[PDB]
Amino acid sequence: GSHMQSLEARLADSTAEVERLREHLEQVRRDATTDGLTNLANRKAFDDELDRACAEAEEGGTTICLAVLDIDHFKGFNDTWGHQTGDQVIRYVASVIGRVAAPPRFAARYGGAAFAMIFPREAASVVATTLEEIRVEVSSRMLKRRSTNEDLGAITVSSGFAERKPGESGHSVMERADAALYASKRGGRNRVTAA
Amino acid sequence: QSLEARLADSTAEVERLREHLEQVRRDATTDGLTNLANRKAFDDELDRACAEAEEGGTTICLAVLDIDHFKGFNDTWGHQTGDQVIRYVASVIGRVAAPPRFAARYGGAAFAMIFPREAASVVATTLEEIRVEVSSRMLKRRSTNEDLGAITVSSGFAERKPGESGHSVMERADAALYASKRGGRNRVTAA
Ligand SMILES: Nc1nc2c(ncn2[C@@H]2O[C@@H]3COP(=O)(O)O[C@H]4[C@@H](O)[C@H](n5cnc6c(=O)[nH]c(N)nc65)O[C@@H]4COP(=O)(O)O[C@H]3[C@H]2O)c(=O)[nH]1
Ligand SMILES: Nc1nc2c(ncn2[C@@H]2O[C@@H]3COP(=O)(O)O[C@H]4[C@@H](O)[C@H](n5cnc6c(=O)[nH]c(N)nc65)O[C@@H]4COP(=O)(O)O[C@H]3[C@H]2O)c(=O)[nH]1
Numbered sequence: 001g002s003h004m005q006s007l008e009a010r011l012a013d014s015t016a017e018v019e020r021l022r023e024h025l026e027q028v029r030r031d032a033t034t035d036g037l038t039n040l041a042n043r044k045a046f047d048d049e050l051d052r053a054c055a056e057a058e059e060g061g062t063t064i065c066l067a068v069l070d071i072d073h074f075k076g077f078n079d080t081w082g083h084q085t086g087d088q089v090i091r092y093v094a095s096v097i098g099r100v101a102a103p104p105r106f107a108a109r110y111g112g113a114a115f116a117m118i119f120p121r122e123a124a125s126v127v128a129t130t131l132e133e134i135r136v137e138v139s140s141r142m143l144k145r146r147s148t149n150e151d152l153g154a155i156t157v158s159s160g161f162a163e164r165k166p167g168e169s170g171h172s173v174m175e176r177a178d179a180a181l182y183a184s185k186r187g188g189r190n191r192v193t194a195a
Numbered sequence: 196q197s198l199e200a201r202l203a204d205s206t207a208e209v210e211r212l213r214e215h216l217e218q219v220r221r222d223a224t225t226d227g228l229t230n231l232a233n234r235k236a237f238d239d240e241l242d243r244a245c246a247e248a249e250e251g252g253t254t255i256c257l258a259v260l261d262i263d264h265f266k267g268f269n270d271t272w273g274h275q276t277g278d279q280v281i282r283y284v285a286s287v288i289g290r291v292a293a294p295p296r297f298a299a300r301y302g303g304a305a306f307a308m309i310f311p312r313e314a315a316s317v318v319a320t321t322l323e324e325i326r327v328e329v330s331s332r333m334l335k336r337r338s339t340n341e342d343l344g345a346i347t348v349s350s351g352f353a354e355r356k357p358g359e360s361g362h363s364v365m366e367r368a369d370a371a372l373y374a375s376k377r378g379g380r381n382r383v384t385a386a
């Protein structure tokens with residue numbers, strides 16, 4: 001009777017705003033973690049996912065590899081063509097990586113013009129060839145400046161990757177993969193290296 | 196009648212999430228190094244203000260600022276100092292961008308600002324004040340108490356022509372900034 005029924009009407013209007021918000025919360029959260037320019041994850045979403053995936057590798061005793069990519073000479077590139085064309089080069093490289101990073105792989109915009117990738121349960125030989133396919137894919141086509149149709153020159157990426165040692169943490173693997181990338185850059189750029 | 200216990204629990208998850216949702220919203224639109232807006236929140240805000248400036252037949256100006264020789268700061272003093280240089284310049288831009296103005300950290304060590312319904316002359320002198328301001332003081336390294344060097348800001352801006360899209364104004368503002376850098380840095384130029 002009545003008061004029992006004034007309550008079921010308030011609890012239905014209340015557990016419905018729970019779902020109206022919990023669904024709206026999921027889509028604000030998806031976009032809070034999506035790097036707007038490229039539609040990949042951002043460094044934050046990546047550093048969270050890299051830690052969660054290292055738990056799954058220690059507790060499960062499985063494999064995980066990690067890769068970093070930088071767009072070569074990207075600073076002097078912006079100065080030549082302008083912020084807007086540079087944003088289009090970032091987008092383009094990001095399209096090449098996103099194609100290849102279907103889950104359980106995880107790809108992110110790790111920096112200003114840098115990317116990070118997670119290959120869970122995959123051997124390094126696979127990672128090493130995936131990065132090599134991405135390297136030539138990126139420099140395969142000649143891109144054009146959109147109003148004027150100029151050649152932008154080839155676009156190349158340097159690359160670093162490493163395999164997580166048994167006791168290694170997220171931060172630590174990243175440190176090593178980053179040393180790998182610096183090694184690729186100081187060795188002539190447009191190449192992959194590994195520890 | 197366990198019912199009053201589930202409605203006390205149900206008007207609680209509404210309070211937990213409605214607050215949590217506004218918190219996630221703020222963080223999706225704020226650069227937590229400088230507390231200005233981030234790039235998404237700006238590009239969205241630019242489209243709103245170019246829409247409203249066309250409906251209202253009124254104008255808006257647009258400014259881009261980059262910190263000069265910023266990479267050399269990270270390299271000499273460390274990334275921990277570099278964040279302080281960004282915070283410092285952002286703070287100058289912040290004191291000066293009270294609403295209806297709108298400042299954000301576009302890109303890496305760059306900023307973008309919206310001046311709606313403002314005379315180009317005032318925007319130009321506002322930017323020039325920002326320029327003398329950041330270079331007015333000689334900052335010291337927190338730990339070791341040493342002169343970090345001069346800090347200067349380059350700057351470019353443009354006013355929106357009547358048919359222009361937000362994309363297009365920023366391209367002009369960006370060309371203006373490239374002229375400032377190419378012409379000696381530490382200055383303001385405009386189309
Ligand atoms: N301590 C500290 N250092 C920071 C921070 N953010 C960026 N930096 C550092 O500053 C370097 C130079 O950035 P820049 O002078 O703004 O010059 C940047 C910028 O002009 C450009 N860039 C960055 N993001 C974008 C973008 O979304 N679009 C376009 N077109 N260009 C971008 O690439 C240039 C190179 O950037 P990177 O290679 O990533 O290298 C960056 C990065 O290592 C920070 O919060 N704290
Ligand atoms: N009078 C005075 N006020 C102080 C002092 N230390 C902190 N404050 C106040 O506290 C604010 C926060 O500074 P922060 O959190 O270190 O964050 C700072 C810091 O990261 C960077 N920054 C500004 N000036 C310097 C500097 O001289 N050296 C270094 N290393 N960083 C600076 O800019 C950020 C924003 O600073 P502000 O907007 O200026 O605002 C500063 C300033 O208003 C001080 O020694 N004297």
Ligand SMILES: Nc1nc2c(ncn2[C@@H]2O[C@@H]3COP(=O)(O)O[C@H]4[C@@H](O)[C@H](n5cnc6c(=O)[nH]c(N)nc65)O[C@@H]4COP(=O)(O)O[C@H]3[C@H]2O)c(=O)[nH]1
Nearest residue numbers: 279280282283286287332333334335336337338339340341
């Ligand atoms: N935590 C904190 N400490 C404060 C604050 N204001 C002053 N101090 C302390 O008091 C000393 C005197 O600083 P000042 O007279 O403001 O004179 C300052 C100020 O004119 C300038 N300065 C240094 N840091 C900042 C800063 O973060 N923001 C601003 N706006 N100015 C600064 O450098 C001078 C020397 O600063 P220091 O050698 O670091 O030594 C500073 C600092 O240790 C504050 O708001 N918060």
